[PDB]
Amino acid sequence: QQLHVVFFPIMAHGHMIPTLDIARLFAARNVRATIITTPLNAHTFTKAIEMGKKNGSPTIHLELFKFPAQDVGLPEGCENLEQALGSSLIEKFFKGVGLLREQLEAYLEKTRPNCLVADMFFPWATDSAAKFNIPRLVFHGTSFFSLCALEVVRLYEPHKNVSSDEELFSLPLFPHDIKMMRLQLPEDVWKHEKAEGKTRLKLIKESELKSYGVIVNSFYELEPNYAEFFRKELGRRAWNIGPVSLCNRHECLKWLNSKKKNSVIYICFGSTAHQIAPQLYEIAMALEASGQEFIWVVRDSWLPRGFEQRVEGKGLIIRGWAPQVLILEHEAIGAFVTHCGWNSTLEGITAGVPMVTWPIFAEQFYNEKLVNQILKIGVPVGANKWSRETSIEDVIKKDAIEKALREIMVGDEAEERRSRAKKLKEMAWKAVEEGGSSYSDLSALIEELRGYH
Amino acid sequence: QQLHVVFFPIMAHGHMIPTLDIARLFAARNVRATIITTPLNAHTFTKAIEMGKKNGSPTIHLELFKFPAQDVGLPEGCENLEQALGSSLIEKFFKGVGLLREQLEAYLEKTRPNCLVADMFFPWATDSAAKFNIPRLVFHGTSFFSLCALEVVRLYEPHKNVSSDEELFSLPLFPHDIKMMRLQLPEDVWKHEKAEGKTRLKLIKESELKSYGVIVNSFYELEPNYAEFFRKELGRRAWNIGPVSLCNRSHECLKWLNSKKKNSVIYICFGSTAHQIAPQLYEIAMALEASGQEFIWVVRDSWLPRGFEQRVEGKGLIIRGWAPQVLILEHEAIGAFVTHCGWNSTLEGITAGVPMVTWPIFAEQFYNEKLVNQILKIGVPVGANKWSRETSIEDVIKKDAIEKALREIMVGDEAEERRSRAKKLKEMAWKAVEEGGSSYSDLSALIEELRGYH
Numbered sequence: 018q019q020l021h022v023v024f025f026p027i028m029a030h031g032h033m034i035p036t037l038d039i040a041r042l043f044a045a046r047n048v049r050a051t052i053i054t055t056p057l058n059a060h061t062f063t064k065a066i067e068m069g070k071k072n073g074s075p076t077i078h079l080e081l082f083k084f085p086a087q088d089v090g091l092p093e094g095c096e097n098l099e100q101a102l103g104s105s106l107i108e109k110f111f112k113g114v115g116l117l118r119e120q121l122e123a124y125l126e127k128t129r130p131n132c133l134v135a136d137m138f139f140p141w142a143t144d145s146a147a148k149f150n151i152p153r154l155v156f157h158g159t160s161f162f163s164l165c166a167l168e169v170v171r172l173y174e175p176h177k178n179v180s181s182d183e184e185l186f187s188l189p190l191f192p193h194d195i196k197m198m199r200l201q202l203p204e205d206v207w208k209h210e211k212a213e214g215k216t217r218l219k220l221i222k223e224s225e226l227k228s229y230g231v232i233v234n235s236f237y238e239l240e241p242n243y244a245e246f247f248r249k250e251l252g253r254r255a256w257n258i259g260p261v262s263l264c265n266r267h268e269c270l271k272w273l274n275s276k277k278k279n280s281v282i283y284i285c286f287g288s289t290a291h292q293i294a295p296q297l298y299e300i301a302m303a304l305e306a307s308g309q310e311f312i313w314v315v316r317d318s319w320l321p322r323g324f325e326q327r328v329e330g331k332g333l334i335i336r337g338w339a340p341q342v343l344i345l346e347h348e349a350i351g352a353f354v355t356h357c358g359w360n361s362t363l364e365g366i367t368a369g370v371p372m373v374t375w376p377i378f379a380e381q382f383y384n385e386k387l388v389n390q391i392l393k394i395g396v397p398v399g400a401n402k403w404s405r406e407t408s409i410e411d412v413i414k415k416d417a418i419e420k421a422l423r424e425i426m427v428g429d430e431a432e433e434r435r436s437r438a439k440k441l442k443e444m445a446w447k448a449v450e451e452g453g454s455s456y457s458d459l460s461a462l463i464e465e466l467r468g469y470h
Numbered sequence: 471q472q473l474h475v476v477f478f479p480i481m482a483h484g485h486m487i488p489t490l491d492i493a494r495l496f497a498a499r500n501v502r503a504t505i506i507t508t509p510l511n512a513h514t515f516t517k518a519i520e521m522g523k524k525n526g527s528p529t530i531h532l533e534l535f536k537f538p539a540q541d542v543g544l545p546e547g548c549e550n551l552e553q554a555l556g557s558s559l560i561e562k563f564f565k566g567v568g569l570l571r572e573q574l575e576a577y578l579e580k581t582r583p584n585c586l587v588a589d590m591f592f593p594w595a596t597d598s599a600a601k602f603n604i605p606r607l608v609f610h611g612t613s614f615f616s617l618c619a620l621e622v623v624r625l626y627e628p629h630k631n632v633s634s635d636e637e638l639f640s641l642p643l644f645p646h647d648i649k650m651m652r653l654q655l656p657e658d659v660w661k662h663e664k665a666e667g668k669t670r671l672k673l674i675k676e677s678e679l680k681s682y683g684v685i686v687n688s689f690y691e692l693e694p695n696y697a698e699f700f701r702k703e704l705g706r707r708a709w710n711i712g713p714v715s716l717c718n719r720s721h722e723c724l725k726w727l728n729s730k731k732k733n734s735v736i737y738i739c740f741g742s743t744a745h746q747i748a749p750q751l752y753e754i755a756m757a758l759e760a761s762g763q764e765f766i767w768v769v770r771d772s773w774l775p776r777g778f779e780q781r782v783e784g785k786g787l788i789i790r791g792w793a794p795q796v797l798i799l800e801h802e803a804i805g806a807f808v809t810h811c812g813w814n815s816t817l818e819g820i821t822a823g824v825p826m827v828t829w830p831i832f833a834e835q836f837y838n839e840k841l842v843n844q845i846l847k848i849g850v851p852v853g854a855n856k857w858s859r860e861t862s863i864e865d866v867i868k869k870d871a872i873e874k875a876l877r878e879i880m881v882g883d884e885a886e887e888r889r890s891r892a893k894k895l896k897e898m899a900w901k902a903v904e905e906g907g908s909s910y911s912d913l914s915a916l917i918e919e920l921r922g923y924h
């Protein structure tokens with residue numbers, strides 16, 4: 018009789034889409050998959066389900082919970098983490114999602130599924146599932162490297178034994194030597210201790226040991242030392258089942274067919290990225306000065322006069338939606354400028370494209386270390402300040418940007434980075450195919466859920 | 471209304487007695503303490519409560535659960551782990567205690583206490599307490615060293631890279647170099663893989679991270695490297711509150727001892743739990759006589775040499791049954807303690823400042839023996855190296871091995887140094903449990919933390 022797994026992502030585009038992909042991976046092994054969402058977020062899933070269904074692909078069920086926006090003083094329209102801009106709104110959003118516990122517990126009591134896969138941001142989901150002897154898995158949607166780095170920083174606080182903003186400290190027990198500065202950490206953790214953010218991270222990392230285990234959107238062969246470190250040194254039970262976006266598997270593409278292999282730079286910072294006019298201006302000048310052909314995705318005081326005319330042969334600006342995967346996988350694309358969010362980083366890896374890394378917040382400075390120092394498939398733009406706000410002082414200048422654009426295309430080790438990225442691409446596809454490490458760990462997890470008593 | 475803590479020990483004398491002592495330590499901080507037991511075990515608590523009460527001491531409540539003996543095919547009389555001898559009986563005993571879950575959940579629903587202190591052998595008690603938003607503490611009744619050693623052996627399997635019974639391997643991450651052989655580990659783990667015992671240990675060790683934390687019957691200053699290792703390297707939240715047997719603490723054998731030189735007499739006591747076969751007792755008797763050492767031997771007549779008691783009349787005393795163990799160990803005349811090196815026994819040797827001849831048999835005892843001999847350096851091994859819940863005639867320790875250990879603990883090269891080291895641990899143990907001590911302090915901190923839990 019059919020195994021039932023319930024998936025409960027936080028309402029953030031970057032968590033919802035990989036959660037859907039995991040639900041789809043489970044559905045393809047004949048597991049009943051239900052995703053919990055809210056009314057204003059349902060369209061994201063309904064569209065994406067049908068736009069990957071009608072091929073005999075199994076059915077993903079949606080369950081809708083009421084988000085108590087009014088109750089916590091959020092606008093009725095604010096059912097997504099992206100809409101909660103400002104310190105006030107974010108704190109209210111987290112109180113809001115915390116009040117979904119009553120609905121989760123009623124749903125589990127009613128449906129009695131075999132497993133709950135709950136977002137990292139719901140540490141309390143473990144106790145909710147335990148009430149009905151249901152195992153809970155934690156899903157973060159980041160790298161093993163980041164999960165390990167964050168935890169060694171939290172436990173060993175290497176940044177308390179420094180005396181300046183830019184003083185380098187090593188990550189303590191790691192099998193690679195990784196240096197960071199305080200600038201690269203959120204200001205709550207290092208400068209003015211704020212129990213809210215600090216208590217939230219503590220409960221998230223503790224959930225990894227208190228729960229049945231951790232599903233990870235990565236492949237063993239990508240970061241073997243950290244897949245092991247997470248399980249051995251840090252004691253987590255984990256399954257690596259990614260890259261989960263490989264599960265199922267236009268004018269700009271015609272434009273690219275005309276171009277030399279590895280000749281074009283793709284720049285796309287995602288939907289999370291909040292780009293100010295002065296920053297866009299420095300990118301525009303750097304692109305022109307670099308001489309490099311480019312496809313630049315933007316979400317006009319911020320364009321140099323005559324930009325659009327000067328770059329007619331060489332540069333394409335797309336306002337809004339780009340077919341990102343089809344662009345990255347085009348032979349003409351030789352590099353990817355990214356914020357180093359894990360979804361973007363994994364798409365660069367899967368396309369075999371070297372990356373210019375532009376970390377901003379969250380786990381991105383850890384992802385940047387993986388890409389540049391361990392995988393050696395990237396070049397840093399030189400952003401070293403962790404910030405969820407964009408101060409004019411933190412804008413990266415034309416000269417830093419131009420240096421990185423040139424290095425990733427024609428720098429001495431640019432070809433070596435391309436060769437290394439092409440190897441990871443082959444290893445990624447091999448992980449997800451029958452017999453691969455990710456296919457295998459998914460089989461092992463399901464078998465283990467089937468036998469749980 | 472006062473904080474209420476429920477204590478749920480497994481029905482083993484070695485877990486019940488320390489659990490009572492913890493309940494008493496909690497009761498003295500004005501915490502309501504209830505102990506869960508079964509009808510045939512209640513006498514152990516009733517006696518021990520009243521034999522330490524009538525002084526206005528705060529009241530420990532008992533709750534009785536029915537043990538489903540018939541249900542798992544055990545004799546009605548088998549409500550204690552000591553009665554479950556043989557592979558068949560032990561497995562049934564563990565199925566039995568597992569079926570107490572229904573009664574635990576009904577009791578917690580009814581009483582709604584602030585915290586459940588549940589035996590290591592009840593990993594499911596964490597989820598049972600969580601149903602009513604009650605924090606669960608794990609209690610094992612052993613050393614930090616044993617908790618760390620078992621876990622490093624389970625995770626890193628140093629014994630899998632071996633080819634023979636007696637080949638020595640090091641314990642992996644420890645700041646001391648500790649060498650063991652497969653013989654010293656249970657035969658399920660190393661020889662013939664049995665998922666039952668292996669799954670049981672896995673769920674016990676996992677409960678240490680899944681639960682609110684771990685109460686430990688040890689003191690920080692006794693094993694500082696392992697008190698830290700358990701919390702840092704292994705990530706457990708833990709409180710060290712022992713030796714818990716000091717809580718209550720502010721005839722003819724004692725008259726017999728007053729006649730004797732300081733540190734001249736060996737005390738031998740394996741406990742009432744101890745199952746000793748006639749051939750083994752016989753080898754001990756011969757070793758004691760041959761050693762020339764004065765002795766007090768506590769035994770729980772085919773196994774005595776003819777004329778033994780008469781030949782040793784000046785030098786040796788055999789006590790049949792109850793001995794005033796504390797008063798004997800604390801007598802100036804007692805220079806050594808022959809023990810099985812279970813943690814309760816090991817801690818009483820430490821608290822009396824008496825060096826120990828270590829005779830490990832099963833459970834965590836070979837790890838405790840490494841702590842005593844290699845780290846504390848207050849003991850000498852008898853040379854038992856075989857982990858066994860059964861005593862086969864083939865595994866008996868012979869007179870010559872026993873005599874060698876009796877001589878070594880009394881007059882061997884480092885005998886004086888072992889006595890000096892043990893006397894330091896004695897002072898540190900009493901300092902830990904007095905107001906301002908590490909164990910007094912961690913107990914205050916735990917209670918404060920339980921008081922502020924939401």
Ligand SMILES: [Br-]
Pocket residue numbers: 239240241242243391
């Ligand atoms: Br690696």
Ligand SMILES: [Br-]
Pocket residue numbers: 385386389390397
């Ligand atoms: Br870097």
Ligand SMILES: [Br-]
Pocket residue numbers: 692693694695696845
């Ligand atoms: Br130590």
Ligand SMILES: [Br-]
Pocket residue numbers: 839840843844851
């Ligand atoms: Br030894």
Ligand code: NA
Pocket residue numbers: 249250251252702703704705
């Ligand atoms: Na660890």
